[PDB]
Amino acid sequence: HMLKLIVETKTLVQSLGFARSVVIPEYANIKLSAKDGNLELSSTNMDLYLSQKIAVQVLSEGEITVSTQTLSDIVRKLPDSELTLTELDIMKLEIKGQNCQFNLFTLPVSSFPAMDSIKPEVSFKISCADFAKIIESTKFSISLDETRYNLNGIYLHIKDKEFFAASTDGHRLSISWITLEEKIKNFGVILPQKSAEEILKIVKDLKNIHEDIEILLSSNKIKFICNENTILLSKLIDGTFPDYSAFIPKSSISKLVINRKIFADSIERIAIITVEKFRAIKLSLSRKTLEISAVGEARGNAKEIITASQDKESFYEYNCDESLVIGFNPQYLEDVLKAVKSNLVELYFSDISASAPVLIKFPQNPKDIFVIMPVKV
Amino acid sequence: HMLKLIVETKTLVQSLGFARSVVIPEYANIKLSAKDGNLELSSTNMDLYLSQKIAVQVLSEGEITVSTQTLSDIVRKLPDSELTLTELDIMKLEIKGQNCQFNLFTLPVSSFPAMDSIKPEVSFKISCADFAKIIESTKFSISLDETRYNLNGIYLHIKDKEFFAASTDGHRLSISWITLEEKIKNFGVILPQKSAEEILKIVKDLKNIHEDIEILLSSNKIKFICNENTILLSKLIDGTFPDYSAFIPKSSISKLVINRKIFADSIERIAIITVEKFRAIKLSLSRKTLEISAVGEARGNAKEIITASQDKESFYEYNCDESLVIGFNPQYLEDVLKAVKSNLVELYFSDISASAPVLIKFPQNPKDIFVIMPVKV
Ligand SMILES: [Cl-]
Ligand SMILES: [Cl-]
């Protein structure tokens, strides 16, 4: 029972790309299992276990483990449209193209870890495109200092018939959600950042983006089954996620509506002049104009004017007689503006003060909510 | 007398790119001098002095110095096709687009160094495209350990009516030359690697690549005048360059001729399996086939076969009844194969031994010569 199979090179390349992004000496290896018409590729690290199955021509069933880096480095440089992989009885894997041959040392399959299991408290199916959106809307506002453990992940939780992703670092809040088909018990987990990054890449793949992903949750792990053939098992962050609806404002006295792109682009160039000790831009809002300005000590200052317009390509509107001057960290604003593809963006102000948290919404994207603490300017 | 000018943004962006690649606190600044229809931009470090002149609308003549990083970071994010630059009397430079304004702190022009001078022993003019070729054929085989000082540059020297570039690291030798229009005294200098990198970028620019570069040499510096308006003054490496014709072989018993691309691509994938402690590939040459193989300890082995062919796209020929087995560092081979755009490449073997230096030539490129020491395999 020795592995032998013919695989489409481009397909193997793509699978190895996911294996590389996942990665103890055993973590440097990938397990290849040829069985029942498929090649199963297994990769694991301290927090993730990834299993991918791809259709191949299974000529002989078997399993080997080999260096992930070595195998992917070779395969992505082979010009052949198909490759033959053969386990030989010298603890070696032969990779054969039309004119070239590579013999890789293999490692004992018995030293490769098998995947653990889950006893889910809840499980449900959502579309890959919906899951990609909620992760893309929350991955950027995860906290990054390792002291606040319960903030270094994305809170995934079911409330009523809705599935939320939420992230915060104490300075901003990001929430994105999906309506579930059936009712389902309320439950929540904190997904580690690396795990979120990996599953996002998997669902965004062109083979998966139009299909569905099953999600299984328990108190100690989460399991993703993406379009049947890709399984990712992840540890969780062991913490309580704060009840974040405490930091969402319930009212507003005024709102800015502005073309998203011109806003993002203006913030970016005005923030160039700032320094790290004072990363802030100032918005001076009026009915007629928006002024975006910043200062940087021993560097200079900058200002851009955006005038009122009802044209979609240059839209700016602020329907309030009272002008408002308010500051923000430009990176936090840019993070939100880049998370959602939308023509317009809306900023809601709780009061006529430069201290209240600001709520950000994109029209034609009602299921995303962002809150940013302002800074004194 | 305060600077004020209108400049095409894209032109300023390109000039600042060269200024950035050049870069003591004074080295962080760029001098802008508006005079007689041009903006002159000066940048300097410990070894280079760069002066660029670009046509602008000089509205008022003057000079300022400002942070290179800050100015380029701002200008490359401005969408305006033209910008106005105005020195104001608060030691500040205003950069104005249509809707935005940046005020940069300036530094005293009197603290910016002026360029030194040259009293050339020889001077001559060659085309930018010819100079680019000889630098591209020699920059990769400069030595990189700082002990052998006289090898960490490109030897530029006039012999008879020919102008040579030559570089070596003790393992390989690269020589490329140009025929000069007039006779000129024999003279040579060692151009530092960074200086070679910078002038190569300048001559390769689309505005300069079809024009000429004047070269002025003295015992202690070299001056380039590229297409009239860009001047680069460089220090030299103070050493004697070895008479390298000692390491060129004068005869050959056999030669391989092979399609350059298939050779480079095969070497690259076969070398994947090697390790750093033994970076070598093996060529087994025969009339009928070329076998390219390698081994990597605790990794595996690899082999590719190239068969005899007279077709240009897959050319392989070796007109010798005696087979030859010879090894090389694959990076040294790849360096040469990537330096010259040519369909075929030729390897000349001094004798039927795996120890003699190998001479490499590209047909339709007679003015390039490369020699590589083989390695035992
Ligand atoms: Cl079988
Ligand atoms: Cl004037």
The answer to whether B47 and B195 are in contact (CB under 8 A) is yes
Q: Which residues of B touch A101 (CB under 8 A)?
A: 302-304
Q: Do B300 and A102 touch (CB under 8 A)?
A: yes
Chain center to CA of B2:
38
Q: Give the number of beta-carbon pairs within 8 Å between A and B.
A: 84
Please report where in the chains the tokens 């050049």 appear, as a residue: B22
Number of helices followed by number of strands (H, E) in chain B: 6, 26
Tokens representing A290 are 């928006």
Please report where in the chains the tokens 């095969």 appear, as a residue: B266
| Domain range for A65 | 4-111
Q: In the sheet where A62-67 sits, what is the strand order?
A: A62-67, A29-35, A38-44, A48-55, A230-235, A221-226, A212-217, A122-127
What's the N-to-C CA distance of chain A in angstroms? 71
Q: How big is chain B, counted in residues?
A: 377
Ligand nearest, relative to CA of residue B63: 2
**Pairing mode, strands A316-318 and B38-44:** unpaired
Please report where in the chains the tokens 């680019």 appear, as a residue: B132
Tokens representing B41 are 């931009």
Q: Which residues of A touch B88 (CB under 8 A)?
A: none
Residue A328 bridge partners (DSSP): A281
Ion ligand 1 residue ranges (Cβ < 5 Å): A 60-61
Tokens representing A359 are 């709520």
Tokens representing B158 are 């006039």
Give me the phi and psi of A277, to 5 degrees please: -70, -15
Tokens representing A6 are 């013919």
> What is d(CA B307, CA B319) in angstroms, rounded to the nearest whole number?
13
Nearest to B60 by CA among B117, B1, B100: B1
Breaks (C-N over 2.5 A) in chain B follow: 23
Q: In the sheet where B4-8 sits, what is the strand order?
A: A324-328, A281-285, A289-296, A300-307, B100-105, B92-96, B82-88, B4-8, B57-60
CA distances from B353 to A259, A300, B291, B322, B369 (A): 72, 68, 17, 11, 21
Residue B42 bridge partners (DSSP): B31, B51
- Who's near B341: CB < 8 A, 6+ residues apart? none
Angle at alpha carbon of residue A225, lines to A224 and A228, rounded to 5°:
170
**Pairing mode, strands B162-168 and A344-349:** unpaired
- Who's near B137: CB < 8 A, 6+ residues apart? B165, B174, B175, B176, B339, B340, B368, B370
A14: burial class by Cβ within 10 Å (0-12, 13-18, 19+)? middle
Name the DSSP class of B248: S
Nearest CB to B73 within list A103, A272, A305: A272
A280: left (phi over 0), alpha (psi -120 to 50) or beta: beta
Give me the phi and psi of A372, to 5 degrees please: -130, 130
Nearest to A180 by CA among A207, A153, A157, A200: A157
> What is d(CA B91, CA B62) in angstroms, rounded to the nearest whole number?
13
The answer to whether A96 and A86 are in contact (CB under 8 A) is yes
Q: Do B100 and A266 touch (CB under 8 A)?
A: yes
> What is d(CA A271, CA A294) in angstroms, rounded to the nearest whole number?
6
- Who's near B197: CB < 8 A, 6+ residues apart? B21, B139
Q: Which residues of A touch B67 (CB under 8 A)?
A: 299
Q: Do A269 and B92 touch (CB under 8 A)?
A: no
Residue type, B145: D
> What is d(CA B240, CA B151) in angstroms, rounded to the nearest whole number?
9
Q: Which residues of A touch B299 (CB under 8 A)?
A: 67, 70, 104-105
Q: Which residues of B touch A73 (CB under 8 A)?
A: 272
- Who's near B370: CB < 8 A, 6+ residues apart? B137, B172, B173, B174, B175, B336, B339, B359, B360, B361
The answer to whether B215 and B224 are in contact (CB under 8 A) is yes
Nearest to A98 by CA among B209, B307, B76: B307
- Other Cβ atoms less than 10 A from the Cβ of A355: the count is 12
> What is d(CA B283, CA B300) in angstroms, rounded to the nearest whole number?
17
What is the crossing angle of helices B9-22 and B68-75, to 10°?
Answer: 150
For the residues of B144-163, what is the DSSP string, one character each? Answer: --SSSGGGSEEEEEEETTEE
The answer to whether A272 contacts chain B (CB < 8 Å) is yes
> What is d(CA B309, CA B128) in angstroms, rounded to the nearest whole number?
37
- Other Cβ atoms less than 10 A from the Cβ of A114: the count is 9
Quick one: resolution in A? 2.0
Maximum distance among all Cα pairs of chain A, rounded to whole angstroms = 82
What is the crossing angle of helices B330-339 and B260-271, to 10°?
Answer: 150
- Who's near A261: CB < 8 A, 6+ residues apart? A343
> What is d(CA B271, CA B55) in angstroms, rounded to the nearest whole number?
50
> What is d(CA A17, CA A170) in angstroms, rounded to the nearest whole number?
34
Q: Which of A102, A273, A301 to mutate to test the interface with B (most CBs of B within 10 A)?
A: A102
Tokens representing B73 are 């970071």
Q: What is the SS3 assignment for B273?
A: coil
- B20, containing H or E segment: helix B9-22
Tokens representing B358 are 């190998």
> What is d(CA A168, CA A174) in angstroms, rounded to the nearest whole number?
6
> What is d(CA B187, CA B199) in angstroms, rounded to the nearest whole number?
20
The answer to whether A75 and A82 are in contact (CB under 8 A) is no
For the residues of B46-87, what is the DSSP string, one character each? Answer: SSEEEEEEEE-EEEE-EEEEEEHHHHHHHHTT---SEEEEEE
Name the DSSP class of B3: -
The answer to whether A214 and A125 are in contact (CB under 8 A) is yes
Angle at alpha carbon of residue A326, lines to A322 and A327, rounded to 5°:
170
Q: Do B105 and A299 touch (CB under 8 A)?
A: yes
Q: Which of B67, B71, B103 to mutate to test the interface with A (most CBs of A within 10 A)?
A: B103
Q: Which of B29, B69, B77 to mutate to test the interface with A (most CBs of A within 10 A)?
A: B77
Nearest to B329 by CA among B174, B169, B171, B173: B171
The answer to whether B81 and B226 are in contact (CB under 8 A) is no
Q: Do B270 and A100 touch (CB under 8 A)?
A: yes
- Who's near B188: CB < 8 A, 6+ residues apart? B155, B156, B157, B158, B217, B241
What is the crossing angle of helices A330-339 and A260-271, to 10°?
Answer: 150
> What is d(CA A128, CA A201) in angstroms, rounded to the nearest whole number?
11
> What is d(CA A318, CA A216) in angstroms, rounded to the nearest whole number?
45
> What is d(CA B85, CA A50) in angstroms, rounded to the nearest whole number?
56
Q: What is the SS3 assignment for B332?
A: helix
Tokens representing B189 are 């200098």
**Pairing mode, strands A100-105 and A92-96:** antiparallel
Q: What is the SS3 assignment for B300?
A: strand
CA distances from B63 to B41, B96, B110 (A): 10, 17, 10
The answer to whether A100 and B270 are in contact (CB under 8 A) is yes
Q: What is the SS3 assignment for B101?
A: strand
Per-residue burial over A58-82, b = 16 or more CB atoms within 10 Å of its CB, e = otherwise: beeebbbbbbbbbbbebbbbbeeeb
CA torsion, ordered A195, A196, A202, A206, to nearest 10 deg: -170
A200: burial class by Cβ within 10 Å (0-12, 13-18, 19+)? middle
For the four alpha carbons of A182, A184, A186 and A191, in that order, the dihedral sign comes to: negative
User: Tell me, what CATH number does A95's domain have?
Assistant: 3.10.150.10
The answer to whether A330 and A292 are in contact (CB under 8 A) is no
> What is d(CA A183, CA A158) in angstroms, rounded to the nearest whole number?
10
> What is d(CA A97, CA A8) in angstroms, rounded to the nearest whole number?
11
B227: left (phi over 0), alpha (psi -120 to 50) or beta: left
Experiment used for this model: X-ray
> What is d(CA A193, CA A172) in angstroms, rounded to the nearest whole number?
17
Tokens representing A123 are 């499980």
Q: How big is chain A, counted in residues?
A: 377
Angle at alpha carbon of residue B335, lines to B258 and A78, rounded to 5°:
65
**Pairing mode, strands A82-88 and A92-96:** antiparallel
Full 3-state SS string of chain A: CCCEEEEEHHHHHHHHHHHHHHCCHHHHEEEEEEECCEEEEEEECCCEEEEEEEECEEEECEEEEEEHHHHHHHHCCCCCCEEEEEEECCCEEEEECCCEEEEEECECHHHCCCCCCCCCCEEEEEEHHHHHHHHHCCHHHCCCCCCCHHHCEEEEEEECCEEEEEEECCCEEEEEEEECCCCCCCEEEEEEHHHHHHHHHHHHCCCCCCCEEEEEECCCEEEEEECCCEEEEEECCCCCCCCHHHHCCCCCCEEEEEEHHHHHHHHHHHHCCCCHHHCCEEEEECCCEEEEEEEECCCEEEEEEEECECCHHHCEEECCCCCEEEEECHHHHHHHHHHCCCCEEEEEECCCCCCCCEEEEECCEEEEEEEECCECC
Enumerate residues 81 to 140 of chain B having a beta carbon within 8 A of any beta carbon in chain A.
92, 99-105
Nearest to B95 by CA among A279, A333, A272: A272
Ligand nearest, relative to CA of residue A57: 1
Nearest to A302 by CA among A276, A327, A267, A328: A267
Give me the phi and psi of B294, to 5 degrees please: -155, 165
What's the N-to-C CA distance of chain B in angstroms? 71
CA distances from A238 to A222, A235, B170 (A): 12, 9, 58
Residue type, B220: N
Residue type, A360: I
Nearest to B135 by CA among B181, B177, B184: B177
> What is d(CA A189, CA A223) in angstroms, rounded to the nearest whole number?
11
